[PDB]
Amino acid sequence: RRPYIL
């Protein structure tokens, strides 16, 4: 559930 978009 960690975001991938930087």
Place this chain on the structure above:
Amino acid sequence: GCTLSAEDKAAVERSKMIDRNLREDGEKAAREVKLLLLGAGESGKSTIVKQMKIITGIVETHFTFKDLHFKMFDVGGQRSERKKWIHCFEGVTAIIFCVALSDYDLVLMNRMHESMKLFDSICNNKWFTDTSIILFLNKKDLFEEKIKKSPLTICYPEYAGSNTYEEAAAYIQCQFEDLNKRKDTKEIYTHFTCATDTKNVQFVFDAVTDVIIKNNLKDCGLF
């Protein structure tokens, strides 16, 4: 690039050589600080320029001060139409308008009124709108003894203040500084001295600082 018989290139490289030296002198064309002079009377302009140099036309003066290199143009030696060649002095950073103080009573028309008209036609000129004017009032001890002998009302009918030194000096200074029709862009700085007081020269530096700094404030993105 077709190299054009190997001589034209040389010519082109010649120009690049020229460019190098040209650009370098252009760098020093920014580095040196210009200073026009103009005095209606004799005004101790020789006294001023020998005070600056210690530390028949244009008399250039390359005096250096506080590690920084200047210029100074003692222009008033040559006599011609002042209207024609004055835009050659566009872009000077500070006019030094040395005025004699004791010329308030010599009559040809009073000579101090002629210096007033010269300061009018130099301070309200379209070429020096963005350039300030340092204002040296010279021979103050001669003015002390001559105001101790003769009054100032001979010079100005509309003056009735005290016959002291400091009130007369402040009145004649505010008489000169009132001639600024363009107060927002330029600013007449003031100074008093006699043929002594070697804090004169550094004062010019002070004034040059107070005309470099403000000038950068009118181009560096601020204001």
Place this chain on the structure above:
Amino acid sequence: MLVSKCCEEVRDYVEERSGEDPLVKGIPEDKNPFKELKG
């Protein structure tokens, strides 16, 4: 000295020379030495 005569002289002189003038007539860009010279 009869200004009409001398301005008429100026007129006939310039009408004599206005043919081969390389500026008011123009250029064909090959006889022109001042092509833009991309290079």
Place this chain on the structure above:
Amino acid sequence: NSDLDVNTDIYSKVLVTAIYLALFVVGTVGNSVTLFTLARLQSTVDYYLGSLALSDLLILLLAMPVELYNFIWVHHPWAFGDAGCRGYYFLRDACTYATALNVVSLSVERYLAICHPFKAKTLMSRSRTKKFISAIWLASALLAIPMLFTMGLQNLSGDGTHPGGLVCTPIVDTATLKVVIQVNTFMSFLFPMLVASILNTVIANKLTVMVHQAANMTIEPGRVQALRRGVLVLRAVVIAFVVCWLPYHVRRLMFCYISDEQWTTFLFDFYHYFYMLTNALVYVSAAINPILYNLVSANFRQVFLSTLA
């Protein structure tokens, strides 16, 4: 099947993208007119102005439409490709580094031009200044090559094979990611922040002790009043820089500093909405650097309505 798709509803999405589109159009038109105007003597500040304007035009026109095209509407199945994503984040990091270094060197040129002006007459020259413009562009490229060294593609489906589950993410491990984005935030925010703030406070201090103490008449307090408008155009640039490029870098480092143990579903949603907010603020800065240079000075106002109409 399409997991890792966040449920961001369309009303806030269309509000954010309307803010984005208005920001984009006014920013690209402002940077266009100021770049053409500076493309239209001690002119060593116009190059910094045009370089910051070109950096803002570049970050807007390169990130922002692609940003709305594949970051807010079209989520994790993207369409720009491997070289597309790597070069896109290369141009983004390069434009951020270029805008930060432009703020640095513009403030340095202002500090030399006021508080030490004879050293600006001696040191600063148009040739050198063009050399420094090329130097800060090359420094932006050389500091953005680690963004080429850290980005990549990664499939995160149920087996890592689906073409509807690959994302374009930093593919390096957490520690080296920390290091590269920590030195990114450290240099490209904090050293501009302290440098621009310190030199702008010193310039405003020198101007206020030049007009208050006055070492003469202030000129009926007119030109020095517009010099305090210049104090406004100083302080507005520095506060706009810190208040726009602060939360973006905080969001980058909160992406680094959390390793899924502090994430929840609501904090995932808050991170994505905060990402829209911080990139809104980045496009705010990209719009209001030329707007701050234009509107507050009436001469720019007149000459740019003459350029427009």
Place this chain on the structure above:
Amino acid sequence: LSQITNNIDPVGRIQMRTRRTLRGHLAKIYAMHWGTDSRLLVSASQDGKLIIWDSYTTNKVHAIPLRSSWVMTCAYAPSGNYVACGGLDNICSIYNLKTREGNVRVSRELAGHTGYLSCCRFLDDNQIVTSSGDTTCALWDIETGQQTTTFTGHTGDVMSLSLAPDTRLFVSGACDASAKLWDVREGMCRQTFTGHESDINAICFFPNGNAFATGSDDATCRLFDLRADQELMTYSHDNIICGITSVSFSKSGRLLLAGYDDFNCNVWDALKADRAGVLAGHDNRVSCLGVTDDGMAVATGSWDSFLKIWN
């Protein structure tokens, strides 16, 4: 003139493109002169340098540094050997070009004036006329250094001067609203043409050397004729109030030029006085503009350090 010759046709609008842009100077380009081989043009700027340009290929063949940065004129030798430059330091320095050593060095730092040197031309390679600030035109020999004939007669300051092409006689335009036709051999005035309200900032001679046009500051070019001693044509119009700063005829005499303080060169038909062209390339005062002697090009230097060569 134009009331008589209006029967002929006009040549229409003349479109002149910026064929060359000789960048390189660092201050205002105050005067330029074409060479006689139509290729090398010398121009002097008030940053110190005078640059001899290759106009055909945009090349800086020479860059002469002055002892005094204030320069206000230049002239290129007909034989191309010398180049003159005078100014506020009152010394019309003659520099050499065809030197055996390789570089340029001052041939003669001539003096003899107590006013600034406004405008100088070369009679031959050994004789130079200079017009000055102490109101006296002067004809100098470079070798002995002495003034051969110092033409007194101007009461106000004299600002420019131009030769008839047969190098026998010249015309000096002064701030007394009058151009005086001097002569080399007799050393005295032949005619004194008036008809101006204000001063004369630049002057030039029409190819036949039977006419010349004065560039005033009331925007009124005035073509004069020598023998009649009266004003012949009043090139003037409304919406131009600025000062003329150089005049230049063409090789055929049909197409006069002017460079204004209105920031743009104005190309005048000499027979119908219409503003037949506008050369608005600059953004500051057009100080100097010249037409080469074969009549092919037009070059123009202005106060923005730009020398635009318009064909």
